[PDB]
């Protein structure tokens with residue numbers, strides 16, 4: 001219940017990873033998407049979801 | 053009575069009071085030549101340089117731009133008369149034997165040459181040029197234009213223009229400053245009397261150099277043409293040559309999006325009217341895109357579509373000749389337009405009458421020479437009924 | 446259904462939420478007593494009996 | 495074998511045209527390969543857009559607190 005909420009959790013090592021992960025995502029969201037178009041002609045299950 | 057005057061004051065009048073004889077007259081304006089395919093592009097797999105007997109192999113396996121090549125406006129006039137219509141040719145020829153021969157060629161074809169002027173001090177189909185070595189490359193400059201490219205605006209036959217319900221010209225005249233000025237006067241007169249303007253592009257060799265440059269030259273004549281005929285290569289070149297080539301070369305990586313794509317047939321792509329918007333204008337009553345005699349993509353303000361055709365140059369391998377096929381399909385269009393005014397606003401009858409143009413083009417590919425083997429109306433009508441099921445004719 | 450066009454002959458290769466991908470197949474009717482040449486899943490080229 | 499034993503060490507002076515990398519400066523389809531043990535050699539087929547096609551879309555799938563909405567994702 002209430003004692004089991006997130007605010008009672010440490011998760012700091014995972015939180016630091018999320019901080020690094022979010023920073024990496026912003027700096028590579030566009031870069032990865034362009035590579036998908038450059039290499040994968042047609043979208044297929046298992047490929048990067050691109051476009052709309 | 054002044055051809056060079058502005059077509060806004062008193063007409064040429066004269067004593068025409070009785071009704072004109074059917075079918076409606078058609079004016080074909082520009083140079084007069086025999087053969088002389090204008091559309092020239094660079095093609096791969098050339099045959100033997102000297103052994104011309106092998107060159108038939110490129111007639112039944114032609115370059116995609118030369119599938120139904122056009123010609124001079126004289127071919128359209130000659131082919132139109134053999135289809136039953138009446139055509140008058142406007143142009144200038146020299147006083148030499150060739151000018152007499154060319155006029156004799158059109159006279160024997162029942163083409164009204166009353167609009168043909170004679171330049172005594174000129175040599176027919178003869179352009180005097182000066183060779184100059186500029187930047188290490190040999191070039192030439194037109195010192196004196198030929199009589200074909202030397203028709204003054206004061207030499208126009210207003211009697212032809214008033215009667216002519218359709219005015220036909222090519223983009224070859226746009227390569228001559230003299231004829232380009234004369235053309236706009238003739239178009240202005242023709243619009244005054246109510247005739248329709250037909251623009252068969254047939255882009256000559258210089259006009260294939262650049263898309264932007266060509267569209268600027270065509271811009272003025274394109275905007276005043278009620279009917280325009282272009283080939284697939286011409287239309288793609290005007291819009292984007294590389295874009296439509298990439299679509300043809302595109303193959304889905306994993307699977308086809310429909311069963312028909314698996315067959316990997318020839319790409320008979322029908323351009324959407326949105327892709328035609330850059331080239332469309334208010335006065336354009338009809339635009340036809342001809343993939344040879346295979347597809348006739350027609351476009352009207354109200355509707356658009358494609359008419360499926362065929363080609364069988366292989367049925368007579370030794371007498372097949374693509375030359376003049378584009379003239380035959382154009383002449384077939386004008387033959388029916390002058391007789392079926394409902395075509396511009398009835399899609400069903402538009403397809404049926406365009407099949408006549410398809411059949412005319414097919415026959416024109418079965419004989420060596422353009423004017424030598426332009427089909428007769430009965431020959432064209434018979435092929436249309438044989439090729440198509442009776443529901444399509 | 447009524448609205449959907451007919452399905453070309455083949456085997457259902459991919460099933461998705463809305464669309465289905467079919468691998469083209471050509472059924473040959475065979476009467477009893479005929480002799481099928483080739484084991485199951487054997488590759489046949491054009492013109493092979 | 496054993497590239498040491500390559501008289502091709504003198505083969506370049508013969509009719510060879512190997513670049514010294516000091517002055518030198520579509521087709522698709524998946525592999526459909528299976529082992530038919532009667533041949534002792536796997537046979538190959540190519541599945542491409544010329545064999546597999548897509549049937550048009552249709553509706554054939556018929557479905558039978560301090561918290562956020564359920565979302566497909568990792569649990570850890």
Ligand SMILES: [Ca+2]
Nearest residue numbers: 122252254378
């Ligand atoms: Ca043409």
Ligand SMILES: [K+]
Nearest residue numbers: 375416419421
């Ligand atoms: K011909």
